[PDB]
Design a binder for this molecule. Structure first.
Ligand SMILES: Cc1cc2nc3c(=O)[nH]c(=O)nc-3n(C[C@H](O)[C@H](O)[C@H](O)COP(=O)(O)OP(=O)(O)OC[C@H]3O[C@@H](n4cnc5c(N)ncnc54)[C@H](O)[C@@H]3O)c2cc1C
Length: 251
């Protein structure tokens, strides 16, 4: 795969994995886990960079949730809605990792696709006009939606505990779409720092403070008495990297 390229197969297997495996770990979707589910889905429908069918599917599922008056939705009930709207023909029946494929089955995979997805949502919401309060409010729900999803659905708790630590510590300081793009970007790099050279690291895919120079030379400053990262150059790299034009459609 290409490190500068994003594969639609990764983003789609992410949606398929989230809907079938992650939400399905809970027999009854209720309370706050349900609220977070609804918020995240609404974010997907609006910002996921999906093709025609995908976006139609997301909107339909999103409309189904909104209509559910029950304050408790058994997964059984939710599974039907996915089936009725045929998430199968829309996404796929099996996960398909490309840029997120690990040197071994237990490496990378979903977690990798979920970060990519989270970053894309942030960028998408920062690459859409938000000068209108109505949508400037929808853009504001991205990071919290992402926080809610991680807490209530993300598989490895080991993983959710470390994100939430960063979240509680400084997410309350993000005051704009680009600010959110950067927060998620640097929070992921903090995680990269913690996991670097760890025994669980994918040998073939060592952690680095991303993006590396080989990927974006203009992103790093040169002087040592100034920030390590040229935030402006980096932000521009992000919007370009996490954009529809950089997505390699799975034809
Ligand atoms: C919220 C969350 C918390 C996690 N916490 C832990 C944990 O505590 N312990 C543990 O073992 N695992 C944790 N994981 C898993 C871990 O972060 C990796 O996903 C995994 O180890 C696979 O790493 P990877 O090298 O394939 O790339 P990943 O880190 O999964 O990166 C996906 C890809 O996104 C890009 N990328 C890299 N850094 C950035 C960045 N800063 N900003 C934007 N894009 C970037 C690259 O193109 C890269 O190939 C967590 C995942 C999430 C989503």
């Amino acid at each position: 795969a290409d490190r500068s390229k994003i594969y639609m197969a990764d983003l789609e297997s992410a949606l398929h994995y989230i809907l079938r495996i992650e939400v399905g770990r809970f027999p009854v979707l209720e309370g706050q886990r349900l609220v977070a589910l609804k918020k995240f889905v609404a974010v997907l429908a609006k910002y996921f960079p999906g093709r025609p069918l995908v976006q139609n599917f997301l909107h339909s599922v999103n409309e189904w949730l909104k209509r559910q008056k029950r304050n408790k939705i058994p997964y059984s009930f939710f599974k039907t809605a996915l089936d009725d709207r045929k998430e199968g023909a829309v996404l796929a029946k099996k996960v398909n990792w490309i840029g997120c494929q690990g040197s071994e089955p237990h490496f990378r995979g979903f977690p990798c696709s979920l970060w990519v997805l989270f970053h894309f949502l942030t960028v998408q919401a920062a690459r859409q006009n938000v000068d209108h309060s109505q949508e400037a409010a929808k853009a504001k729900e991205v990071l919290p939606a992402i926080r809610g999803y991680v807490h209530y659905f993300f598989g490895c708790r080991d993983c959710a505990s470390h994100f939430e630590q960063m979240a509680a510590a400084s997410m309350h300081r993000v005051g704009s779409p680009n600010a959110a793009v950067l927060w998620l970007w640097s929070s992921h790099n903090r995680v990269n720092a913690r996991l670097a050279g760890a025994p669980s690291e994918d040998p073939q895919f060592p952690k680095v403070q991303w993006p590396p120079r080989e990927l974006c030379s203009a992103c790093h400053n040169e002087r040592l008495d100034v920030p390590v990262w040229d935030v402006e150059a980096t932000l521009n790299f992000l919007k370009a990297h996490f954009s529809p034009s950089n997505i390699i459609l799975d034809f």
